[PDB]
Amino acid sequence: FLGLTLALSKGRILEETMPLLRAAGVELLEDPEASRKLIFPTSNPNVRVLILRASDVPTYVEHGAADFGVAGKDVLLEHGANHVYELLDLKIAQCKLMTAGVKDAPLPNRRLRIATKYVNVARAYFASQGQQVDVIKLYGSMELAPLVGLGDLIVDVVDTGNTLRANGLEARDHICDVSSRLIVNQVSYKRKFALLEPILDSFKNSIN
Amino acid sequence: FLGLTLALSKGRILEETMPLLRAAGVELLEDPEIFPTSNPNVRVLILRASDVPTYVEHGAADFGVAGKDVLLEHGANHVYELLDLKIAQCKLMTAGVKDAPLPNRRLRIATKYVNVARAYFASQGQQVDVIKLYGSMELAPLVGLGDLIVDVVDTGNTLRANGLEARDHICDVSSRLIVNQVSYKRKFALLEPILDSFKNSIN
Amino acid sequence: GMLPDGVADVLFEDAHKQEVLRHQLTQQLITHGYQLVSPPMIEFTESLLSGASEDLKRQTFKIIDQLTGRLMGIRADITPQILRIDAHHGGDGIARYCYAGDVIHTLPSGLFGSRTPLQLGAEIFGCESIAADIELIDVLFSMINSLDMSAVLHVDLGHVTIFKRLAELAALSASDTEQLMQLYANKNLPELKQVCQVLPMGSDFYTLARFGHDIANLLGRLSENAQQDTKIVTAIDELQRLKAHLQVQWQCAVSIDVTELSGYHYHTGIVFNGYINSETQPLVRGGRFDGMPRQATGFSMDVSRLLAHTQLDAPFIVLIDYDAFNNLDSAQRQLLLQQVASLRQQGYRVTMPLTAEDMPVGLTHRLSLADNQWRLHAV
Amino acid sequence: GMLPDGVADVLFEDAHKQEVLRHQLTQQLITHGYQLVSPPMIEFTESLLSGASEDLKRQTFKIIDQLTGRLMGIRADITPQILRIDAHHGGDGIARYCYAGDVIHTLPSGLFGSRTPLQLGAEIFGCESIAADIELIDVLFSMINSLDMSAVLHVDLGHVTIFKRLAELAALSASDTEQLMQLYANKNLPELKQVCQVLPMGSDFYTLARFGHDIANLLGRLSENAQQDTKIVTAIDELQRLKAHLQVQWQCAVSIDVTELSGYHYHTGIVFNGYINSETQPLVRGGRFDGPRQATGFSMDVSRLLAHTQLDAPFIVLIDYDAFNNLDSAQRQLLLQQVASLRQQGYRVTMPLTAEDMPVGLTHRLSLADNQWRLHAV
Amino acid sequence: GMLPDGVADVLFEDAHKQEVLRHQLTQQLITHGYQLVSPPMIEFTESLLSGASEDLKRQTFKIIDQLTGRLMGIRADITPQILRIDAHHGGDGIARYCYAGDVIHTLPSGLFGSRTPLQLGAEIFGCESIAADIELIDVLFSMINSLDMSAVLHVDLGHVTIFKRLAELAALSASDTEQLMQLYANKNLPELKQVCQVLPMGSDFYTLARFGHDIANLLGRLSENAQQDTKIVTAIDELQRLKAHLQVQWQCAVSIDVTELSGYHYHTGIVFNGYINSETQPLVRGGRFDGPRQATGFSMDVSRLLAHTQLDAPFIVLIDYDAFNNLDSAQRQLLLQQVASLRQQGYRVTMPLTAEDMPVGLTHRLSLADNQWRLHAV
Amino acid sequence: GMLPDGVADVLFEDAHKQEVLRHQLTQQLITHGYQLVSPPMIEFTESLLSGASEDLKRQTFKIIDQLTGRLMGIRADITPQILRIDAHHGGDGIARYCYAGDVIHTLPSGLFGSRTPLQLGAEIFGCESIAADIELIDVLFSMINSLDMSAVLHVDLGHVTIFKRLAELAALSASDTEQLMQLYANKNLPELKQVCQVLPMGSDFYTLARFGHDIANLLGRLSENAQQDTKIVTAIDELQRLKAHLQVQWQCAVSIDVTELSGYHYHTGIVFNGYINSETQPLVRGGRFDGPRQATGFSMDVSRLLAHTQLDAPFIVLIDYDAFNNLDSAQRQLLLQQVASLRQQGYRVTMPLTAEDMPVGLTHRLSLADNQWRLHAV
Ligand SMILES: O=P(O)(O)OC[C@H]1O[C@H](OP(=O)(O)OP(=O)(O)O)[C@H](O)[C@@H]1O
Ligand SMILES: O=P(O)(O)OC[C@H]1O[C@H](OP(=O)(O)OP(=O)(O)O)[C@H](O)[C@@H]1O
Ligand SMILES: N[C@@H](Cc1c[nH]c[nH+]1)C(=O)O
Ligand SMILES: N[C@@H](Cc1c[nH]c[nH+]1)C(=O)O
Ligand SMILES: N[C@@H](Cc1c[nH]c[nH+]1)C(=O)O
Ligand SMILES: N[C@@H](Cc1c[nH]c[nH+]1)C(=O)O
């Protein structure tokens, strides 16, 4: 295969990206949600799509298995985006990375225990606040961690704050703003710019 | 809360564990798809399988059920593996594209099971480059991210349906009962009745 | 900025406490006849790791001596340095040593464990008698008791000789030993009972795991081949002597675990592990290490682990009033400095201020001039 | 069991002495209002060497953190760690710190130097006044005097501000600075006179080396451009103030050298070097340094005091083996109480394991005569 | 017997291939008038790292010369050694050099990179003209084309002069430069747009990252202060000249990136990166350097060619054991002459020690039939 | 600047020569059925120094792998790497390996010796027969003869088995062995005769030193217990077979020394040392060792051949600058085809950048005379 491989996260990212793609001349030929397929052809026979877990998109793109992808700044910050180009803020799937603790419970006086997916983001943030923390890596749902005293706080993605409040947690500190970004393999940007430029302009046009 | 907190993985592990629990006097009071049980001493956490060792080793859970696959990958130094439950049986294997030949470079392995991968290829005297994947691995060989994958295999149907085939058998996988070191010393009186009912249920 | 995992500043009152503990405990050991030695942080690997387990070699950071090109290490353990020192200075008779020093580990031992413990310890060289093992317990408990801690030390007694004799007598393979040590370490009683039913003297290996704690009756539960072994009977007798001594002399709750093979693998007999409250990582590790032969037994503890369980009297932090002092004649100033010198000798922390705003941290008292007189005044 | 050059055991009575000195001196500093801090032996290089000279970077052993893959260092100097600590905890006001800890150097500093000094020191942060520099001298000499040493401390005063102002005003190149610092360090007056005849304000740079010692008249020997520089006039005035304070208050022989730039290059002003007797390596090194925060302090190798300090002979007691083993339980308990009393008084008492069990340097036996335990000189 | 990450044996046919490639390519460069030099693996750091960035210093393993006590390094790069050699032997005129040698890196450069590349390269010293940069491209593509590879080389052109002139004209701080070089290296366009709105000439620094690829129109997008700078206008003109030469002469797809500063920071002008297929780490790195002498050159890891080059299957011959041992002296001599003839023609002939002595990948037997020795495919 | 003692540039024609020698000799070994392997410069010490003498450990520079924190070494010898490779790939049958690579020594071996030899060698694994030792001599002398050297290789044969069997049979102490090896090494015949009169079978140890050279008669001079010992009779028979083979097949002057224990102490049987003219350090070192797996091989420093090998003077050609620039496109293409033809024939042709562009050691100009391009000696 000689054209562009686009890495997409399933769920929120996928649904909000289809309009940008359609405008760039790239329609998927069926609905992924009801398919046992992970490589999808499109109406542009140069472009094909991979449906991945959001955390694997930077991996596939940096190694060139995908030429470009859409992933949240949250996944990019955690993973480290040194080996890819973040060309475009797409301003889709907007949320924030925040610390969160039990509702009305105060910070204890001991060494803070943080439970999170976003281990590197956590270390970075608490470093910048001059705070030394013990970090516990969680792959799954983090809202449980403070309630059984695994961690004092969690670092997680927050939109309305409804998921926190419904589990007896509340947002404390704002770490940074999160939006899905267009990332490109460094080599793919140099070698396949002719194939990319039309789609990057159509994405640039769709946003502004 | 003064009693036992049981960490359970959702999916295959959960469905196969309910019978062992029922026999130990622990029924969940609703379908998960923090939970109280019919024994008011025991409560249950429904976690991602990979987080069970974490919750147990830190004492947020007193004991849990996780596959030998997750325990081998995580490292089970800080917990006690008390029981092979002989449920959710499968195997960790290497897998590649059907009939595709080994390249001449260092093999590139794409897998969740990064440490298991390094361990296995070490034991076969082979040096590998490993790429960490959190999601579905069957795609990795097909777009040439890795040469092989390390994944859990039951029938082998998921591999064959994606144009892959099992190569090497790494080890056998079964769900195990793990216990927090402190919980085993301090709450043995609450544990022993449930451990015996689990020991009894495997006959 | 941020520090590496398992590396922490000890600051302010914690630093003062650590300094007092290091000093009190070192002086105690010196008064019990232990010779203080202060070996360096770095040696050549030839001497530092001479007869070391792969675990001690892996815990030792390596560096290159730019004078010779040869490999050196940052010590992860002082005991091997005491061995080197004893070899040169100790002679053939009994010799006692104590030490306190920083050691560095490449990896932490426990969940969020320290990589920079302040290792403090004692070694007795040149005595075979269990009496030397009893003297060390006496010295250790003398030290623990002097700290007036709220927390209580649980002692776990083990003996590596017991399992090693059973392994030799039952002629276990290299791998069968590994499978039993793994099952012991995870207290897998069911899967052990299965493995043990097919092993020679297999019932003895199951007995260790099920009935090892009951040391009074352990001998009467072992096979005739095992019961006849002098090294096993000695081992079980040493545990009973120490267990008794610890309960009678020191009112210590002792638990026996003859499946404990977890310390530094240079251990050759009796092993002791002191746990503080319900903490997973032991405060104190000790046991026999006859093997450079020279007889040797000792213990080490991380002084830093005592911090959370020891208290000092709140300190007196005194600030001399700036304005009042500068209003004094020369003779009046000299008179104050004599009074300040008296306070410092008594352990008062007195700041002679540089400015009106010069404020010591956690101020308790002001030294103030009221009716031509200098007195302490709580704030 | 050979050791690396510049690495030595401190053994037995020397180890006891070192432990007493470390503790006496730490307690003195604490009672003078200095906060004891004990920072770790290892940090990431990012924090440990943050704004460090090539000399400090070269003296720091590097090691690999296997958790992150990042570089760490074994500290060669604690002062940078006090700076990090002060930055977080110190605030904007005055803050005092003291420390005692092992540091490791890759290379020895001078002729047969240690690579493992026990660095003990004090820092004052947040005061511009020469008063802070005067307090530290007073604290240091308070400490030196408490040791009741026979040996005497010669103090060498320098000031890096003087050369640094001349370097800025004469607009020196990177390499010309290096050639002058090399020549200054061996006080090569002939080869300096040659180099200085071609340099701008070159006569001023030669004046530093030839007439730096005579601080009373140094200003009147400098070029008009130099003499009008406020930072140079302040610098030379600070040396005169400290020289006077040291002679008047402390009866200390002071020598000036305004070309001493051999200390750690984080120094930004006054520098102090304390030499014990005629020893090549200074015992004490101190000076001004900077974060936008004022800082001054000193450090000393406690190990260098050992050969010049003495303690009271220790009392080393051996309980008679045969007599003790002849005792009933109640009689044994009675002895242990008496032995506990002796240890509390600082007696070194060995409860023997065998008849041959002999403590090193035995002074006294605790012996049983007529149902009574008494000390007996051997 | 596991090896360190980024260290691999090159074995058997791969080793033969590597040896052929090393030799073919070295002879090509020699016939193009490049002088072969073979400098040592180790020098003193004074010479090996003379005017080196932190990146080159960090990639160089350090070792101790036990004769002098001085620091040496295992070379991570040969180019600085060519510079030393040229300084002594080269004179003021034009000089050409080629080299092939092992170099060692402390860390791998990219995802699963080698730490032991076989570095092969050419340098032209003493010519300012872009003509020297064009000769090297011609020599390199002459070499690449001779390999008859299926894989294709994508060339990336950069120019460090452009950013360095903008840094000087905008009078950027030491730290601001670092933050821009970090952002450029991940082409973080959003976070760069934010940083650039507060920097002097900030729009020019954003223009480099967003519109650097479009070199035809880049000049017309820069600030008037920037557009007036001769060194920037020359730089952008040099890129256009090379881009044109590569497309016209060589039918080469060129991409421009004027923010490429990831090569060794001794580069002073034009930079070239050759990528093979879609591989992350470039095969070829080249550019201008000046450590008062003009210099330009390139280097490549010969080992990276292995997976993309093929040799004719080799002829591996085994002499029949039993037949040979049945021969008289004169008959044996006659065979050895025939075997010598086969080896001269490049046949791999094994004279067997036993009946079981079997060469790996046997293709032919040399067998005796009717008093005659002939080859027989197995 | 200056280079470390025992470290030298190989420049220009010496570099060309070294490159040709490395390649010719590697191809020869490959055609004799030896598998080329190219193992890395650095491994973990665990594998690199696995079963090594203290001499090989001390010749190996140590470095820290920053990925793992573990110790690595720059190889001082490739043979141990062939052993590792053979262990994995070789199997139980016979296996042949050849190699050429740089190795680094911490100290020079002889007065002003190299610390950076280009080690080239062959190993046979899995054959007990002296036949394998004879094949290696055949391969070596095939290589030496192909070099057309003026200098002559003197071969010294030893056999460590002989002395080791005498040491075992005479039941010598640890220290008595040391005193005999010291006396042998300094050919102290008088002080040996004294020591030997008190040792059991002492006359046999004296016989080795006095009559070891005369291998034809050595067996008939030894004690009855020695003369019957199978391992001694085999050893002396192996020396006679090799001595004969070297003189008859290869016209090589052989000297025997059964008291030679010089070379890497991993040697376990026959040993060969090739000396070039009257040079103190041997060019070639070889003999038996153990992978249990049988092993024999040799190594040589290719760089030691340079001073004794000559190549045909090279043709260094400069195309006339002015004439070339006067050509149309079709005329330029026509020249480049002619230039390509010359380079294929090994001519060194420089396409000039300027009128002054002069290749080093110019022999010929390619000049245009009467619409034709011809070579012209200068
Ligand atoms: O702030 P709120 O409005 O409550 O929503 C934020 C939540 O939305 C996501 O859930 P989801 O499980 O849908 O994300 P994922 O499945 O894509 O990981 C994410 O995990 C947040 O917890
Ligand atoms: O029957 P097979 O074709 O051999 O496949 C069995 C599957 O079971 C595992 O995932 P599962 O969906 O059971 O659990 P998970 O979703 O929690 O990983 C695993 O990923 C296999 O693909
Ligand atoms: N040094 C050992 C304890 C010990 C001292 N002597 C014998 N054992 C440890 O750190 O665990
Ligand atoms: N740390 C310095 C002395 C010092 C402390 N503060 C200022 N100077 C040294 O050892 O050389
Ligand atoms: N030696 C450089 C390439 C180069 C040669 N000359 C100039 N640049 C490298 O390997 O990256
Ligand atoms: N490697 C040895 C020679 C040898 C190879 N095989 C056996 N001996 C040397 O350099 O001296």
UniProtKB/Swiss-Prot annotation, chain B:
Pathway: Amino-acid biosynthesis; L-histidine biosynthesis; L-histidine from 5-phospho-alpha-D-ribose 1-diphosphate: step 1/9. SUPFAM superfamilies: Periplasmic binding protein-like II (SSF53850). Gene3D superfamilies: Periplasmic binding protein-like II. It is found in: Cytoplasm. One of its GO terms (biological process) is L-histidine biosynthetic process. InterPro entries: ATP_PRibTrfase_cat, ATP_PRibTrfase_CS, ATP_PRibTrfase_HisG, ATP_PRibTrfase_HisG_short. The keyword Lyase does not apply. It holds the Pfam family HisG. GO terms for molecular function: ATP binding; ATP phosphoribosyltransferase activity. Its main location: cytoplasm. Keywords: Amino-acid biosynthesis, ATP-binding, Cytoplasm, Glycosyltransferase, Histidine biosynthesis, Nucleotide-binding, Transferase. Its EC number is 2.4.2.17. It catalyses: 1-(5-phospho-beta-D-ribosyl)-ATP + diphosphate = 5-phospho-alpha-D-ribose 1-diphosphate + ATP. One of its GO terms (cellular component) is cytoplasm. It is an enzyme of class 2 (transferase). Belongs to the ATP phosphoribosyltransferase family. Short subfamily. Lacks the C-terminal regulatory region which is replaced by HisZ. Catalyzes the condensation of ATP and 5-phosphoribose 1-diphosphate to form N'-(5'-phosphoribosyl)-ATP (PR-ATP). Has a crucial role in the pathway because the rate of histidine biosynthesis seems to be controlled primarily by regulation of HisG enzymatic activity. PANTHER family: ATP PHOSPHORIBOSYLTRANSFERASE, ATP PHOSPHORIBOSYLTRANSFERASE ATP-PRTASE. Heteromultimer composed of HisG and HisZ subunits. This is ATP phosphoribosyltransferase. The lineage of its organism: Bacteria, Pseudomonadati, Pseudomonadota, Gammaproteobacteria, Moraxellales.
Curated annotation (Swiss-Prot), chains D, E, F:
Pathway: Amino-acid biosynthesis; L-histidine biosynthesis; L-histidine from 5-phospho-alpha-D-ribose 1-diphosphate: step 1/9. Disulfide bonds: none annotated. The keyword Cytoplasm applies. GO terms for cellular component: cytoplasm. It comes from the Bacteria. Keywords: Amino-acid biosynthesis, Cytoplasm, Histidine biosynthesis. One of its GO terms (biological process) is histidyl-tRNA aminoacylation. GO terms for molecular function: histidine-tRNA ligase activity. It is found in: Cytoplasm. InterPro entries: aa-tRNA-synth_II/BPL/LPL (IPR045864), HisRS-like_core (IPR041715), HisRS/HisZ (IPR004516), HisZ (IPR004517). Required for the first step of histidine biosynthesis. May allow the feedback regulation of ATP phosphoribosyltransferase activity by histidine. Heteromultimer composed of HisG and HisZ subunits. Belongs to the class-II aminoacyl-tRNA synthetase family. HisZ subfamily. This function is generally fulfilled by the C-terminal part of HisG, which is missing in some bacteria such as this one. This is ATP phosphoribosyltransferase regulatory subunit.
